[PDB]
Structure 1
Amino acid sequence: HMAQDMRSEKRGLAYGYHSENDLKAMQGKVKWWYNWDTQADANVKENYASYGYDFVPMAWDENFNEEALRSFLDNHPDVKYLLGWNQPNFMEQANLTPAEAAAHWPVLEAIAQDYNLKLVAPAVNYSPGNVDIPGTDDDYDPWLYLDAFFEACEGCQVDYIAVHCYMKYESAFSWYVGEFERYNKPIWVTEWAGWDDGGPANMGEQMNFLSDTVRWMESNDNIYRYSWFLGRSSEGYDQFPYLDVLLADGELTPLGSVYTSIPSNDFRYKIPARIEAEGAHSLTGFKHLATTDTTGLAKLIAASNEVAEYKLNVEEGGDYTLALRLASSANSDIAIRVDGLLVYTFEDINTGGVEAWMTFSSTPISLTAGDHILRVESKSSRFGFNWLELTN
């Protein structure tokens, strides 16, 4: 039962109904959260900090309960950030022109001064265009909105940019978020999921999109924080567009397992440990699906020559046995490398079905103390891969 280091410093969640069991389930894998509101969720307000979280209050629009916000900040001095207006460029959200959003900003600056907070700019996305931006017909444009906001907010304290995105193509997401780097402030992606343009065709597509975009954000130094939309949805995890991270109390969905398992660039796994397959530091080709296996929640799926790499901090050199939890309708071959060198091949792995699971163990593999890359390579095979375990 190896206690791993903090999996990510950037990763957060957008959700307002956490239990303590929910925070414990994500502990050490999620750093922060917000709930669109002025104080932490009632059932975790007393104890959230003891599980490693910081809570980020929000002033959703200019009519936010300032008394409630200041009272919360009086009792929670670890709070470091405050989020400004939610989608002011949407008539159905905060509904403030750039000039109005700037005119109300001093209320937030006074709170930031009083409690030593940094401020996140109002969150924007492409909009229906029903909040006017002066000087353009392109009222839908989020950069034109922020340009006008900053021009009106002369001298304002704005430490970070907030971005929402509902595109479903990872290359569109990276282009879009990258456009906000022009303002020379670290970015918080405070809501995203694949949803527009028809959205995901199935849960696996959303899991793949989440993986691609989380991995891009972990590697982009200009991204400060990100939070998936959202913890739980009213319709639930298996209904389009498959949003939920949390399932039953204190438990994750398949998508939430992917979200919480993906490591930062600098995180390193300690061993002996079981490591979820979806916690790879690097994936080439591998895709994601839910699994019906008796443990675990998500699986990687190979169809050809896919590669997954896991970066290890081996504190005790020695001979470790590698177990893989696998499903394979035909014969699968899987090559295992350490720092690029072949140490073992699983040969003719066959379970008889895509959700017929077995655990397969290697011979002992010599690992010296230090940093190593464990590489799991499909050799022209079709299989599912739930988790791995290194034992000594």
Structure 2
Amino acid sequence: TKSVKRGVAYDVASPADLSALSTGMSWWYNWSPKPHDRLAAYDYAGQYNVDFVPMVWNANLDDGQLKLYLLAHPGIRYLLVINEPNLVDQANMTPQAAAQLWPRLEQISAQTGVKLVGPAMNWGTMTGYGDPVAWLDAFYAAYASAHQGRDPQIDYLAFHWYDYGLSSMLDRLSRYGKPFWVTEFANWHTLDDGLQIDSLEKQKQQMAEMVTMLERRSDVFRYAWFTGRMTPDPHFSSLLDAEGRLTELGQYYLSLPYS
């Protein structure tokens, strides 16, 4: 038994890594429409009690291939859409470009039953749209313009955050009246102010604070820690080390209480 909210943002490739994660982790995603090819002939849901959630990263979408996959995996009830549109190095989609895509996503929702989770917002780099509120206001106005004043279908907003104040950013984004998935988080504060996360204890402290807060929010359905492994790892953000082995952080993550 474990939290339905608790996930990882990582392209899990190894069944051994699922053995390690699955004691506390309910789900994962890999920024892509299908799991890693290594897992194709493994019943991961039945053996590890984990689910994979597909994602449409940007407008480069093979609608037919995704529909075919979702319809044959009716256990999949959610589709993550649009990875950080206001970041030029990520989805890099203007409000209009996202409005133009959206009916294709709504069609996939009607044809398969999946709820749309996204766009996945952060503080951005796109000219004029650093503030996710400015980007989302514009996306809502663009979509409503094209559809006789109807709002875009948003079942859940998604959010990524690598700093203090995650609860304050969710409060600010509540103005849309939508619940959230927080699909990337960790604390990567770096500036020399006393708050820099420059030790494992400090990442463990901030993981406990953030996880407790996300577990206790009724408007947060799922979250995903960033990430399984990375190198270099200056904030000690990795949950995994050797194939099939947790780090101290990973063991700690899986042990945390939940609602």
Give the conservation status (yes or no) of the 8 Å contact 1:38–1:65.
no
Question: 2:229 matched to 1:228?
Answer: no
CA-to-partner distance for each residue in 1:89-109, whole Å, 9 max, x for gaps? Answer: 111111111121111111111
For 1:183 and 1:7, the matched residues in 2 are separated by 30
Opposite residue 17 of structure 1, the aligned amino acid is V
Runs of 5+ consecutive residues of structure 2 not aligned to the other structure: 145-149
C-alpha contact 1:7 1:262 (8 A) present in aligned 2: no
Spell out, residue by residue over 1:266-293, the C-alpha distance to the aligned partner (whole angstroms, 9 max, x if none).
xxxxxxxxxxxxxxxxxxxxxxxxxxxx
Shift of 1:71: 3.4
Report the AA paired with residue 240 of structure 2: L
For 1:258-277, list aligned pairs within 5 A.
258-265=252-259
State the AA in 1 paired with 2:45. Answer: A
Cα-to-partner distance string for 1:226-277 (whole Å, 9 max, x where unaligned): 00111111x15xx302111122222211111111111212xxxxxxxxxxxx
Report SS of the residue matched to 2:158.
strand
Give the secondary structure class of the aligned counterpart of 1:225.
strand
Give the structure 2 partner of residue 202 of structure 1: 199
**1:65 to 1:230, Cα distance in 2 relative to 1, 3 A:** farther
TM-score where L is the length of structure 2: 0.89
Q: What is aligned with 2:159?
A: 163
Please give the secondary structure, in 2, of the residue aligned with 1:252. coil
Give the TM-score, by structure 1 length: 0.60
1:241 corresponds in structure 2 to: 235
Contact kept in structure 1, 2:12 and 2:18, CA below 8 Å: no
CA contact (8 A) 1:96 1:131 kept: no
Q: Secondary structure at the match of 2:121?
A: coil
Q: Distance in 1 between matches of 2:178 and 2:9?
A: 21
- Equivalent residues of 2:86, 2:121 under 8 A apart: yes
**Structure 1 segments of 4+ aligned residues over 4 angstroms from their partners:** none
**1:49 alignment partner in structure 2:** 45
Aligned length: 247
User: Match of 2:10?
Assistant: 15
What are the equivalent positions in structure 2 for 1:121-160 lying under 5 Å apart?
Answer: 121-128=118-125, 130-132=126-128, 139-154=129-144, 155=150, 156-160=152-156
Structure 2 counterpart of 1:62: 59
Q: 2: CA distance between counterparts of 1:54 and 1:197?
A: 33
Match of 1:191 among 184, 193, 196: 184
User: How much has 1:67 moved relative to structure 2?
Assistant: 3.9
What's 1:368 paired with? Answer: none
Q: 1:95·1:131 contact (CA, 8 Å) conserved in 2?
A: no
Distance 1:77 1:99 in 2: 31
Specify the alignment match of 2:170 in structure 1. Answer: 177
Aligned residue number for residue 147 of structure 2: none
Matched residues in 1 for 2:212 and 2:13: separation?
Answer: 25
Deviations 1:132-175 (A, max 9, x none): 4xxxxxx31111111221222233221001001111x3xx2221
Which residue matches 2:76?
79
Aligned pairs for 1:272-311 within 5 A: none
Report the Cα distance in structure 1 between the residues aligned to 2:58 and 2:212, rounded to whole angstroms: 32
SS of the residue 2:124 aligns to:
coil
With 248-257 and 46-55 compared, the bigger mean Cα shift is at 46-55
Deviations 1:191-224 (A, max 9, x none): 1111144341112111111111001111111111
Whichever residue aligns with residue 209 of structure 2, its letter is D
The Cα of 1:40 is off from its aligned counterpart by: 1.6
- Following the alignment from structure 2 to structure 1, what is the Cα–Cα distance between the partners of residues 38 and 72? 15
CA contact (8 A) 1:39 1:68 kept: no
Per-residue CA distance 1:344-390 (angstroms, 9 max, x = gap):
xxxxxxxxxxxxxxxxxxxxxxxxxxxxxxxxxxxxxxxxxxxxxxx
Higher share of residues assigned strand = 1
Q: Deviations over 1:40-70 (max 9, x none)?
A: 2222244121121221111100013334423
Higher relative contact order structure (alpha carbons within 8 Å, sequence separation ≥ 6): 2
What secondary structure, in the 3-state scheme, does the structure 2 residue paired with 1:122 have?
strand
Distance in 2 of aligned mates of 1:178 and 1:214: 16
Please give the secondary structure, in 1, of the residue aligned with 2:246: coil
Q: Structure 1 residue 118: deviation in Å?
A: 0.2
Q: Could you tell me which of 36, 39, 57 is aligned with 2:34? A: 39
Match of 2:249 in 1: 255
The answer to which structure has the higher helix fraction is: 2
Q: CA RMSD in A?
A: 1.6
